[PDB]
Write a protein that binds this ligand. Structure first.
Ligand SMILES: [K+]
Ligand SMILES: [K+]
Ligand SMILES: [K+]
Ligand SMILES: [K+]
Ligand SMILES: [K+]
Ligand SMILES: [K+]
Ligand SMILES: [K+]
Ligand SMILES: [K+]
Ligand SMILES: [K+]
Ligand SMILES: [K+]
Ligand SMILES: [K+]
Ligand SMILES: [K+]
Ligand SMILES: [K+]
Ligand SMILES: [K+]
Ligand SMILES: [K+]
Ligand SMILES: [K+]
Ligand SMILES: [K+]
Ligand SMILES: [K+]
Ligand SMILES: [K+]
Ligand SMILES: [K+]
Ligand SMILES: [K+]
Ligand SMILES: [K+]
Ligand SMILES: [K+]
Ligand SMILES: [K+]
Ligand SMILES: [K+]
Ligand SMILES: [K+]
Ligand SMILES: [K+]
Ligand SMILES: [K+]
Ligand SMILES: [K+]
Ligand SMILES: [K+]
Ligand SMILES: [K+]
Ligand SMILES: [K+]
Ligand SMILES: [K+]
Ligand SMILES: [K+]
Ligand SMILES: [K+]
Ligand SMILES: [K+]
Ligand SMILES: [K+]
Ligand SMILES: [K+]
Ligand SMILES: [K+]
Ligand SMILES: [K+]
Ligand SMILES: [K+]
Ligand SMILES: [K+]
Ligand SMILES: [K+]
Ligand SMILES: [K+]
Ligand SMILES: [K+]
Ligand SMILES: [K+]
Ligand SMILES: [K+]
Ligand SMILES: [K+]
Ligand SMILES: [K+]
Ligand SMILES: [K+]
Ligand SMILES: [K+]
Ligand SMILES: [Mg+2]
Ligand SMILES: [Mg+2]
Ligand SMILES: [Mg+2]
Ligand SMILES: [Mg+2]
Ligand SMILES: [Mg+2]
Ligand SMILES: [Mg+2]
Ligand SMILES: [Mg+2]
Ligand SMILES: [Mg+2]
Ligand SMILES: [Mg+2]
Ligand SMILES: [Mg+2]
Ligand SMILES: [Mg+2]
Ligand SMILES: [Mg+2]
Ligand SMILES: [Mg+2]
Ligand SMILES: [Mg+2]
Ligand SMILES: [Mg+2]
Ligand SMILES: [Mg+2]
Ligand SMILES: [Mg+2]
Ligand SMILES: [Mg+2]
Ligand SMILES: [Mg+2]
Ligand SMILES: [Mg+2]
Lengths: 159, 133, 148, 211
RNA sequence: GAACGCCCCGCCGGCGGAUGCCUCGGCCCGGGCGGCGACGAAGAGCGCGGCGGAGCGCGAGACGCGGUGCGGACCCGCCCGCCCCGAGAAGCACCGACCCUCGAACGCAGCGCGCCCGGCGCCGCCGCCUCGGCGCCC
RNA sequence: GGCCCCGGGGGCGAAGGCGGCGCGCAGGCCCCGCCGGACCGGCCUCUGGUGCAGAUCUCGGCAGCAGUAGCGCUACUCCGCCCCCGGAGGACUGAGGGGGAGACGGGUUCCGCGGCGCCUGCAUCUGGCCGCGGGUGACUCGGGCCUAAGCGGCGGGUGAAG
RNA sequence: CGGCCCGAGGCGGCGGGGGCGACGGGCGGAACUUAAGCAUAUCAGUACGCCCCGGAGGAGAAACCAACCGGGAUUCCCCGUAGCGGCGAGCGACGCGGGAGGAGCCCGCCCCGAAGGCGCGCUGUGGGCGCCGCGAGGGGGCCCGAGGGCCCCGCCCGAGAGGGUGCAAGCCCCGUACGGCGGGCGAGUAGCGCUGCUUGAGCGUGCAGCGCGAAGGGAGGCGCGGCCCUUCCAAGGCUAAAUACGCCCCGGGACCGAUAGCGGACCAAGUAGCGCGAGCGAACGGUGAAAAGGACGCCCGGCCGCUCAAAAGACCUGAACCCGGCCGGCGCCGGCCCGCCGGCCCCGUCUCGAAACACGGACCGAGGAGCCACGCGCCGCGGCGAGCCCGAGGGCCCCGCGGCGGAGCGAGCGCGAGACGCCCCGGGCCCGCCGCGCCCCUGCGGGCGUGC
């Protein structure tokens, strides 16, 4: 099976020379709270993103870009990241001894985290003195309100 | 070492190919050397055996030279003239001892139009090879 | 390998280690786990407390990544800093240049307080803290921060 | 196999043993009946492969190569090394395309008796194996490792010779019979790119030498 | 006592088909391919060779006919036939035809009969010819 | 899968078979003589459909028993010369026949010539056995037609379908 | 009497019907079995029966998932527990994440109105891999029935894969390596009530009958009513790829070797033979290098001898059980040279106990029964170690996510471990669950303590 699939993609690559095997796909954020800070490859680019750079759906499809008109952006940073990706790709494309790009086009890379610095004094004014008490009040806010209502109802009905 | 993958290296399949071969393949399988003199003249190393060829035999218990009287293609052997089983009577007929064509060198060839032409065909092909190499 | 096994050292012995009085029969106790309340009760009570019955609330579909919650101790915070800059941060302990560690970038949410920290100020940014984690950090001169 | 026929037990009361029988009375469907099934038929779901960790595989390759560089284990493995200059044997050959020139180099270095040992040992094996496409056995000689130099077309024909490109070395070729010390004829380029190969292995360090 | 029976101190014979060696066969894996039929399929019956029982093949043009190429001395017995710078045995590949009865099986039946001088089965779609209705109207 | 120091043993005789000595506590191993006529191993590492006295075991061959138990329908004899053919004698079936013919079933068993390998539970020169040739002719006999008891078909009806 | 409507007979052209031991789609649908009994459950939404395509088929461009600093039609591969249940035995999805592959669209509705495919249609057409061919290179001497054997001296090698040849052949012959041709958005509907089947779907996963029957509507894994938020648009349709597979052809194998391997290796096996029928179904491989397949003579089938290395003579070798002729003698262990003396019940099995009047076993040969897959526990060894890891896949080599371990406890809201110790055992103290003094800041919240 490994050999069969390699032969098939070799034939297709010859047929469509010098196009790449893959379309340009967007960079998107993984769905969970658990996979929250890293990116991956999506299905297509939004029409808002295409309106960023000029291209229409047909024109982008022709020059080799996956376009997904069912996706909607959730913020402005999504747009900025993907418009940078579109803009750079349109920079790096040529249109007609040519070179046929291999693999995924512009792979997504997730950088390792670096350490930063700062000042204790400016850090302190962001937090109260008893952070654990602060957090505990926020955590128990609703339950205490229900209990407070129940007590006030006790006294009210018992006059 | 073989490289070609449509050709078996399986003993069962090779032996079944040697038997049950068709007549043209069997005829090609029944070849023998040309002598040095005919090698010089025709520039060819081997020929399929035939009636009317004169053959010089070695490596066997029936050694001699004679003309090919019969071809037993089912057996892959040839009945030569003068080379017989030792008979019992003084009168009774001869009975040929069958010789296998690879135990012979052909000494003098039967010629006709087809023999001439196929030899010249083979020379021109060997020349193509010699020009390539 | 078949040639190093117990079963072949029993050739010429009739029964093969299974006994003459008892023997080897199909299923002399039943199949599977059956009998746990009747004739296997001694086994089930000796080795499996709380195998029978019911306990607690049930959820018809659990959200695995909602309920996911990784955690880090404060004795691990200084190993997320690469090895080639801790010596310097330790030598020049600064209120004006302090190491900032963000633990959600490394994939932890809450910070607990097992262990101890070196005598050096540090900001730690997480999404929730435990009481003695806060205590020990604010005791060494660090600051707890909440990160989005 | 064994279960296409129709057979059932006759029962007690007819003075015969109780196995299943074909219409007529012939025994069937027992491992002890002629024409019955196997007691436990063989099946292709047997686990045929085995797993080895990547460090362990690399360590086996490196220990086989370490063994290859001893004049004592190579002589005790079976090769003929009486007229060789060195056991780490590095020879610059450039390109060899004719078997006659490859034999010439092997003679000029001193590996001629190993190849003659291999050549004069071809025989027909002792058992059933000669009905199953394994009719002849030859002994094993030198292994040539090459990097940038066309040599396979000049060395392959020789009896008891094997070819290995230096970037992918085979443990089954380094330790034939599971015996480590193979005689290796090294090209200069292969012997000079060995360290580069181990540098190309990623997040890998060689194991510690010992006494 | 001999003889019968038994054991073998050895030498030969029977009956039987084990053991050893061999193998144009099985089994397993993988890769191809995925190509029937009212223009009559799959399958069945009967018949066909110079001397012809079985199996393969073929269909009253029957152990096969023609065309295009290749090939180049045989054709298992007895007979014929061919033989040669082309005159052509064995063999191979494509293409064109022939293609009895039954069978989705098609004039009815299954071996016997018709209606009419072409021929003559069922369903469906689209057209067309000829027609019915105290349906709606003229 | 390897090794078996100029590359392991073999028609100057392999595997197997039959007798005989030696070694080992033993499982077993090794050698010699005779047969046989083409393949076979000792040591290291790997693998398994890996060792039989028994299962009223399976398949095949086969002993004692043992030259043993056994071979309704009255009946043959003499000569030519066999239970076959001929002549002469003596009997039987006894017209609901051991007679002469059909229906069904069988399928060539029918006829002539020849024969004894098989069969003819004894024999055979006999034969429904074996070989080689042959053989059944319809306006008037039957089938084809008619309908019996029945069976099928019919715009359609029903059922997830058949 | 004509038109339109609804029908009838005939004629022409075109299409359908049957066939397959797989893969695929739609229906109907068991029981054995497990639960150590047996009704629910399980087996199994399987066997089997009926229908229907194709080279694949089915599915498919959200009336989707979710709860995020969010994804984005369908299929397939890797990976892993919510729940169901005489809460028993058992049963059991999926999203997120990593890969293979990647592709999108149009009818009704609305506008034009015959512009159309014009004998129709205004009850609405039309537009918006296979075929060829060449092909290198060894003699001389012994001996044999026969040189591929033994001795000694060589050649070819891009070819020492192999088959044949009278005995182990690179060089005796076919082949083998190296190359040429073809190439504006869907009504008896959605939903609801009652009932039957089905699902992990639990006060309903999906379907269906019957009764009722909408307008903005659907969904958010616990019901009802109200207010919000997030996210989609059912009741119409088409669509490549990645995926699965017998027959037949091709290649390979640590597989079987004639009672094995398919039932079937044998010029005539689903054959001969058996059954009214549905159906059942064997046994039988091997002369020799060459048929050279058996001269001449003598008796009246036999004897002599003939071919051949050899009868190997209807055929390779040719064991055992059992038997015939010639020769010798009249059970195991032990001593002695040898027929005396001493000892010795029939094994296997169940059983307290077998020589048993307990059962199996006339004899002989060949065959004949703890193997494999998955899951769980413990032990040993190898590699690396707060880490570890040949998923799938992509380029015996190289790159490669989960996952498991790293923190526990609590029904849950949740909270959350340092203090000692060569090792082991015990003591003490810390974390969670249950309880209770006391102090306080942001408060049924924080701190500090006491107890099983
Ligand atoms: K045991
Ligand atoms: K017991
Ligand atoms: K039981
Ligand atoms: K049981
Ligand atoms: K059970
Ligand atoms: K139980
Ligand atoms: K409860
Ligand atoms: K069966
Ligand atoms: K029995
Ligand atoms: K029994
Ligand atoms: K069988
Ligand atoms: K590893
Ligand atoms: K390795
Ligand atoms: K053997
Ligand atoms: K085996
Ligand atoms: K008797
Ligand atoms: K006669
Ligand atoms: K119906
Ligand atoms: K069912
Ligand atoms: K059942
Ligand atoms: K029951
Ligand atoms: K039951
Ligand atoms: K039940
Ligand atoms: K249940
Ligand atoms: K059930
Ligand atoms: K139970
Ligand atoms: K892709
Ligand atoms: K020859
Ligand atoms: K309606
Ligand atoms: K409804
Ligand atoms: K269920
Ligand atoms: K429930
Ligand atoms: K109703
Ligand atoms: K909800
Ligand atoms: K639900
Ligand atoms: K719900
Ligand atoms: K059989
Ligand atoms: K017993
Ligand atoms: K008993
Ligand atoms: K007892
Ligand atoms: K006993
Ligand atoms: K006993
Ligand atoms: K007794
Ligand atoms: K007794
Ligand atoms: K007795
Ligand atoms: K007993
Ligand atoms: K009894
Ligand atoms: K009993
Ligand atoms: K007994
Ligand atoms: K692993
Ligand atoms: K609790
Ligand atoms: Mg014991
Ligand atoms: Mg027991
Ligand atoms: Mg009880
Ligand atoms: Mg029986
Ligand atoms: Mg079998
Ligand atoms: Mg015939
Ligand atoms: Mg066995
Ligand atoms: Mg026993
Ligand atoms: Mg009378
Ligand atoms: Mg007669
Ligand atoms: Mg008789
Ligand atoms: Mg009449
Ligand atoms: Mg039960
Ligand atoms: Mg189920
Ligand atoms: Mg489809
Ligand atoms: Mg159910
Ligand atoms: Mg068989
Ligand atoms: Mg014999
Ligand atoms: Mg008995
Ligand atoms: Mg046996």
């Amino acid at each position: 099976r490994k050999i069969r699939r390699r032969q098939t993609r070799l034939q297709k690559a010859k047929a469509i020379f010098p196009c790449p095997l893959q379309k340009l796909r967007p960079s998107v954020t993984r769905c969970s709270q658990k996979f929250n800070l890293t990116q991956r490859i999506g299905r297509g680019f939004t029409l808002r993103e295409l309106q960023g750079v000029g291209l229409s759906a047909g024109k982008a499809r022709q020059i080799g870009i996956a376009v997904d008109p069912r996706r909607k952006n959730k913020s402005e940073e999504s747009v900025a990241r993907n418009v940078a990706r579109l803009k750079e790709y349109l920079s790096k494309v040529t249109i007609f001894q040519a070179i046929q790009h291999q693999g995924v086009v512009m792979p997504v890379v997730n950088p390792k985290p670096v350490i930063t610095t700062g000042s204790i004094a400016e850090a302190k004014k962001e937090v109260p003195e008893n952070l654990f008490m602060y957090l505990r009040n926020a955590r128990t806010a609703r339950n205490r309100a229900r209990l407070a209502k129940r007590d006030a109802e006790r006294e009210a009905a018992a006059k | 070492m073989k490289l070609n993958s449509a050709v078996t290296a399986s003993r069962r399949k090779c032996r079944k190919a040697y038997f049950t071969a068709n007549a043209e393949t069997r005829a090609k399988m029944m070849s023998s050397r040309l002598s040095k003199e005919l090698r010089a003249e025709h520039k060819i190393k081997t020929m399929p055996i035939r009636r009317g060829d004169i053959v010089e035999i070695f490596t066997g218990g029936h050694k001699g030279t004679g003309k090919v009287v019969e071809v037993r293609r089912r057996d892959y052997k040839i009945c030569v003239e003068g080379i017989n089983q030792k008979a019992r009577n003084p009168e009774a007929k001869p009975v040929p001892y069958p010789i296998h064509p690879s135990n012979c060198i052909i000494k003098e060839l039967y010629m006709n139009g087809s023999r001439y032409r196929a030899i010249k065909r083979r020379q021109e092909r060997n020349a193509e090879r010699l020009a390539r190499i | 390998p078949t040639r190093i096994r117990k079963s072949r050292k029993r050739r010429g012995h009739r029964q093969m280690g299974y006994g003459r009085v008892g023997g080897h029969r199909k299923h002399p106790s039943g199949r599977g786990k059956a009998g746990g309340l009747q004739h296997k009760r001694t086994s089930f009570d000796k080795y499996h407390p709380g195998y029978f019955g019911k306990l607690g609330m049930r959820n018809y579909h659990v959200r695995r990544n909602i309920e996911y919650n990784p955690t880090i101790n404060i004795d691990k915070i200084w190993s997320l800093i690469p090895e080639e800059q801790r010596d310097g941060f330790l030598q020049r302990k600064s209120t004006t240049e302090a190491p900032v560690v963000d633990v959600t970038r490394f994939g932890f949410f809450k910070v607990l307080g097992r262990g101890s920290l070196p005598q050096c100020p540090i900001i730690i940014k997480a999404r929730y803290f435990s009481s003695d984690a806060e205590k020990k950090l604010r005791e060494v001169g660090g600051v707890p921060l909440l990160v989005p | 196999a064994g279960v296409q026929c129709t057979a059932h037990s006759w029962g007690p009361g007819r003075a015969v043993a109780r196995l299943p029988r074909k219409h007529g009375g012939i025994g069937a469907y027992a491992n002890f009946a002629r024409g019955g099934h196997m007691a436990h038929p063989t099946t292709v779901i047997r686990r045929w492969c085995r797993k080895v960790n990547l460090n362990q595989r690399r360590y086996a390759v490196a220990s086989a190569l370490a063994a290859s560089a001893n004049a004592a284990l190579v002589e005790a493995r079976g090769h003929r090394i009486a007229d060789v200059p060195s056991i780490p044997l590095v020879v610059d050959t450039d390109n060899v395309t004719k078997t006659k020139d490859a034999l010439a180099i092997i003679k000029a270095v001193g590996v001629l008796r190993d190849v003659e040992r291999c050549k004069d040992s071809r025989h027909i094996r002792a058992g059933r194996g000669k009905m199953r496409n394994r009719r002849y056995i030859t002994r094993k000689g030198p292994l040539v490792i090459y990097n940038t130099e066309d040599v396979a077309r000049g060395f392959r024909n020789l009896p008891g010779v094997d070819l290995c490109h230096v970037s992918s070395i085979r443990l089954l070729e380094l330790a034939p019979g599971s015996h480590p010390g193979r005689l290796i004829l090294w090209t200069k380029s292969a012997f000079a790119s060995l360290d580069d190969v181990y540098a190309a292995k990623q997040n890998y360090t060689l194991p510690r030498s010992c006494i």
